[PDB]
Structure 1
Amino acid sequence: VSMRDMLKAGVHFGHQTRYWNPKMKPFIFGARNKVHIINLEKTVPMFNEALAELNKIASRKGKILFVGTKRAASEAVKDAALSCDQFFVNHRWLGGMLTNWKTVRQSIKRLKDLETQSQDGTFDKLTKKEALMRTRELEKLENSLGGIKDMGGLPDALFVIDADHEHIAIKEANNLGIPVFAIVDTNSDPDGVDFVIPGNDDAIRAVTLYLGAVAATVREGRSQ
């Protein structure tokens, strides 16, 4: 990645100053019309170090869970995780997805079963309205667990867009000792993140930049 690419992507744009987290002071460059400006001179090396560590994780045949559920980030994170053969959560994070994996995997199994019943013709022997009921259940399980249906266990890393919004997932990973790589905007707490990447987590341009880079890095880790 390059500083100029980041800047044209809008990565340097933090939040308004009245909403800052004071712990984000070392990564703030200044203010522009009451809005904090992130120091890309910190962002570039820190992102490059996160990229190298993620490359190593993908090289050990590791699973990376992409987490972003903001409306701006959902489709992009899904595309990024799919294009690099990884796992994602792009709709509401379910409390206990990781710390209560022994329970959530049962819903994943039910997702598998309902998907086969949708490609097995078992839905035809159903009383029409129950076909719609099971379709609703399949669709909701797909909304919430589609991205992790084949994860098969705890991931080896989390890549998070907007640490503040995804605080539950960060907390769960910390509880289970799973390294966290996050875009940490100026309003956010960097304390639960092992690899902090200071930057905008709201605009699609910046989000897509981060995600494309992470997907490419894990692809190179797999290929190498």
Structure 2
Amino acid sequence: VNMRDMLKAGVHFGHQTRYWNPKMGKFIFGARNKIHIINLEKTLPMFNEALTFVERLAAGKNKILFVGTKRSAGKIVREEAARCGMPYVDHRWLGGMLTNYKTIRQSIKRLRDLETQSQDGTFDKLTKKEALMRSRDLEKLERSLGGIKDMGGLPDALFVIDVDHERIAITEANKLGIPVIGVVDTNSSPEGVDYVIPGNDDAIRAVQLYLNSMAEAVIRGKQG
């Protein structure tokens, strides 16, 4: 907010100068010490416009999926999905999570039934030779599928933190014609992102800044 909060945490940084997508050239303020620098004066209006978009979309009882699976990122994405609701993914994105959603509905149902019978009084009362490995199966399933337990329909908008890390996901969205909100860095390509946010990745302070901005926007939009 107000050109200073992001000025300190991590935003004005880029993946060196050897690696850089030329299509991002319009968002480069300059290069210092063989590191690309992003022009904040251009990304503030885009960030505010995206916040307005998300706030207005959250008024209308509709879902925005959060995608942030990466080092030290999927965690805070999880706790930001905590409160304000909304779906999320924090571990590996399974190919076909959108274009092949009918098949993954079955795994959703299997997880829901297994978790129902797991905490129904601990129905896993049989011998531990099978109980521990069934619990391991539950753990592995909830690890990569826990976020979209709810949200039975297709999400309306997708929010991704890193863009080239999540390219598969973006492609699926671009096939179903749903908007994409992304934090595009220097190396990534802004192609396939409807609301490009030229920010920074890998910076915990920066990424939590985006997550809290999004959380407050969606909370205000849903409040009415």
TM-score normalised according to structure 2 size: 0.97
Question: Which residue identity does 1:58 align to in structure 2?
Answer: A
* CA displacement 1:139-165 (0-9 Å, x = unmatched): 111110111100111111111100111
In the alignment, is residue 33 of structure 1 matched against residue 7 of structure 2? no
Q: Residue 191 of structure 1 corresponds to which residue in structure 2? A: 191
Q: Which residue of 2 aligns with 1:119?
A: 119
Code of the aligned partner of 2:218: V
Q: How far did 1:92 drift?
A: 0.5
Are residues 1:79 and 2:79 paired?
A: yes
1:8 aligns to 2:17 (yes or no) = no
Percent identity of equivalent pairs? 74
Q: Which amino acid aligns with 1:181?
A: I
Distance in 1 of aligned mates of 2:160 and 2:19: 20
1:159 aligns with 2:159: yes
Cα drift, residue 11 of structure 1: 0.6
Tell me the C-alpha RMSD between the 2 structures.
0.9
Whole-angstrom CA distance in 2 between matches of 1:26 and 1:197: 13
Determine if contact 1:158/1:180 at 8 Å carries over to the other structure: yes
Deviation at 1:205, TM superposition (A): 0.4
1:43 is aligned with what amino acid?
A: T
Whichever structure has more helix as a proportion of its residues is: 1
Name the counterpart of 2:70: 70
The question of whether the paired residues in 2 share the 8 Å contact of 1:72 and 1:203 is answered with no
Cα deviation code 1:45-83 (max 9, x no counterpart): 101111111111111111011101111211111111222
- What does 1:201-220 align with in structure 2 at a 5 Å threshold? 201-220=201-220
Normalising by structure 1, we get a TM-score of: 0.97
Question: Partners in 1 of 2:129 and 2:200 — Cα distance?
Answer: 46
Measured in 1, the distance between the counterparts of 2:72 and 2:31 equals 24
Amino acid at match of 1:81: A
Aligned length: 223
Residue in 1 that maps onto 2:178: 178
* Structure 1 stretches of 4+ moved >6 Å: none
SS in 1 for 2:58: helix
State the alpha-carbon separation in 2 of the partners of residues 145 and 50 from structure 1.
27
- Please state whether the residue corresponding to 2:88 is helix, strand or coil: strand
Unaligned runs of 5+ in 1: none
SS in 2 for 1:158: strand
1:168 aligns with 2:173: no
The one-letter code matched in structure 1 to 2:169 is A
CA contact (8 A) 1:200 1:206 kept: yes
Deviations 1:17-63 (A, max 9, x none): 11111111111111111111011111111011111111111111110
Deviation at 1:171, TM superposition (A): 0.7
Describe the SS at the equivalent of 2:124: helix
